[PDB]
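Changelog-linked ticket: manganese (II) ion example.
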Amino acid sequence: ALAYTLPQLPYAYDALEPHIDARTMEIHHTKHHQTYVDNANKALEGTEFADLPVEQLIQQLDRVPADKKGALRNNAGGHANHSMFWQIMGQGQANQPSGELLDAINSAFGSFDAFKQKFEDAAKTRFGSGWAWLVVKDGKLDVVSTANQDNPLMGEAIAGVSGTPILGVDVWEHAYYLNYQNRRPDYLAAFWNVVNWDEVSKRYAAAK
Ligand SMILES: [Mn+2]
């Protein structure tokens, strides 16, 4: 009766090549994400929180037992973040959104190109491990970043920022070191080639 399972990827391990290497995809998924799933399930065992979806759980960290707060923040956080991450990438995806998402990007950031710059800048200036995010907050889009496995859905007091993510990029060095080593900006440039903007559009619609 374990709470979470490792999701299947929506594509093969080499589907994102050369932008993201196959070996990275496999380790990232089968070692790193799996560890977050396993440690989250351990932390949830003696609780009333094992039946909640992970995205609801991370919105309730203040309510869980005090001794399990850190472990769930880190591991439920890791699980939520990676689960989204696999889904917002895809193969055979210049790659950009359309329709209402693009309209929201133009009004929030000026243009898709200016949005990409702001997103990259957030991801670049994230010192240490973390994520950069495109969030819906008060019906409007913004770019924020978080430390480690914090997610904007955890709220401002915990994560330092708020909002409902519809896109994120993992800037933990494990996400890019085998292919780009220290060159995080090259990783980030490459990332735009794999974003599934149909998926991000669905998430935008879901988040308002
Ligand atoms: Mn990661």
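Closing comment: Example verified and attached. The beta strands are 130-137, 140-147, 164-170. The two ends are 33 Å apart (CA to CA).
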